[PDB]
Write a protein that binds this ligand. Sequence first.
Ligand SMILES: *Cc1cc(OC)ccc1O
Lengths: 193, 242, 264, 99
Amino acid sequence: GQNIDQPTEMTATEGAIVQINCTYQTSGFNGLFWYQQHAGEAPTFLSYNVLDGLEEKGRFSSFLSRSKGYSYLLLKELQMKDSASYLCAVKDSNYQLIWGAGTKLIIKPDIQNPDPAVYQLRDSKSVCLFTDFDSQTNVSQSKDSDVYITDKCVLDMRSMDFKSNSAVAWSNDFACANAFNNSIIPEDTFFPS
Amino acid sequence: GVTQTPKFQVLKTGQSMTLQCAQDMNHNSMYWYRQDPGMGLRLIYYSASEGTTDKGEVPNGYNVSRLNKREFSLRLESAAPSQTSVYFCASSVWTGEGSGELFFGEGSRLTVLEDLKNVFPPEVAVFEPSEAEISHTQKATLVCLATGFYPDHVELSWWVNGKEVHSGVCTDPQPLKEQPALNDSRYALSSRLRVSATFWQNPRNHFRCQVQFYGLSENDEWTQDRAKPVTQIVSAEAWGRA
Amino acid sequence: MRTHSLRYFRLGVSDPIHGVPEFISVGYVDSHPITTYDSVTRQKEPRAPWMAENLAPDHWERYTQLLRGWQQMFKVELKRLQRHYNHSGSHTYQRMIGCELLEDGSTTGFLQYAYDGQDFLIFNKDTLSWLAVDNVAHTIKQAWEANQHELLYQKNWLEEECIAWLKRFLEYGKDTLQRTEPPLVRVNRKETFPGVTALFCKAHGFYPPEIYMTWMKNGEEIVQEIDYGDILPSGDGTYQAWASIELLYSCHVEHSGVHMVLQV
Amino acid sequence: IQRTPKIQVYSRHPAENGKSNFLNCYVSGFHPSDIEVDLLKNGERIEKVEHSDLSFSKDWSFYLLYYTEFTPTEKDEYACRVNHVTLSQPKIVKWDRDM
Ligand SMILES: *Cc1cc(OC)ccc1O
């Protein structure tokens, strides 16, 4: 065939539902595959459809409409561990696999008690931490360079059933008060004196 | 079921390289893919069954040999920078079966450079919990920083009292570029381990941030004054303080 | 439009005597060969000029690789069958897959296996199951039926892929496959054994090979013995056939929507 | 269950002595596939003979077509000679001269 399209990226909330579409324009059709690929890992097979209908395997379902050149992968009761890339692939007339470029799925944790804050950490032998904000907050990169800001990262303290967002900022003039100016942060963000 | 080596390799341009893949599932078909950002998997060569192979979509610069039923080798003839990629070996029971899925190896991360002189291991530093956070949240966050490394060949882990921990940890999925504009920028990577304030305040709790770096091998020759940037572990650590 | 069909055969021969390939695979559209492959050339080749002209070299290249794999599969399957039956020596394994596009636009599809030239397994694409002729075939059946997705893949291939391939090939070879060459038909009369007159109605020069021929008495159907000649290739792309009886008689012929009557 | 070949020998066009034609031999319904076919003129093998590839029937048997250009005469006897594992010796099947 010629072409497979699936979104570059999708974001949804923990506990909810996401549908990942894959359309294909191929010369012939011999089945559609979905693969899960965690960051830094190998793809693993999730599903196969070749006739019309929906197949459920646990929290994951795969749907195919041959008439519309269309499939989706449906994930229910989203968990953080569903964060991964999902690869759509179609076998054509000559049994060749045509691969879409993958959909990265980002899962937003459900933050029960937001406590937005920027703390200063000093070296053992320095660094700023934007943390405990709610998941609608977005972290922008820096303008002034030799100044580094990482993306949001969700940690899970399993034994306390507690998740939290954070992002790190560091440099070598630089101040934690200033650190996340390029980003739009909660008005009530705690800045320790 | 699919075993693939090496997981990491640094190459100088013009070096030749063989990647090995073995499969003990008595599968008949094997495949070599490269995976590059922003596109789908691309087939380099494949082997429909023992005793035959054929070009995939991007064969140039490579060749392969189906050694036997189990093994499918991938060769880089004269390594070029554009061949910097993540390589995946795969097998299926047959080819031209409809439903037969692929089984993938763990993947091979290959970096091809003009010279080995920009290869650098990371510097590692641990940053202790601010006591403002401890007062405010009664939780303690430790931050690890691996900086100045090249290429992007690291695996960061946390170790508490000589044992590796996964709970309360989050590590950036990918490094950032210390010099965004340079094509050979070095990288930085941050991570966080959060514990209870009480756990941190326990003076005999030992925290170590560990970074495995994949660099040059014994084989690679090195004539510079700085130490040869071989594969190595670099750690930084901290003890609890009331 | 008339009925057309697409058929692919595979023939696997155990420990072949000098000469005969271990594996042969040939495709047909109607009665015309269109593709070939065997274990001696190890190459996929066109067997009709309208296939060669309309399929670029990378198609032949791709299917060369697929048949080499199917050859290996066929070899192994035959070995397992021989073991199940406790057979030694040289045996044969055959496969036939294909589809038909009927006049009325409806379709058929079939997939069958034979062992030593006899039915072995017959696929039923409507209940997705395999019909087994004996206990050995039944063993293979349970194996194939355990793979649900694979059963669905095959139904899809017979109902959709096969039909699409067939339509594609029909278009490629239309000047050959959709043409009509009407029959030349004659009736011969002769006294044979004393008192026994034989009537032969003989046709030749026609294409497609499908032709209907019969003898009537006084315009109503004969309830006497009619002998039938096979429809045989004349070597020039056209076919010949006949029907005969003993002794108001007339031969009726239908070919490609044209009816013909020859009165004795 | 082996199946011995049907052998049919016949001209392309209705035959007339003196006029150029083609002699066909259609060998069919045999199993297994190994087979040998020759066209004969007066007992002797004809050297310029075309044939189709081995072909497959839905009933799992095989078939073949051998033919040669010929000009039939009263004097000349044509036949098709076939060997197959079902046969103790090659079967020589005479053309019936389009009787
Ligand atoms: C040999 C072949 C087979 C096929 O479908 C089974 C399509 C095209 C070619 O060439």
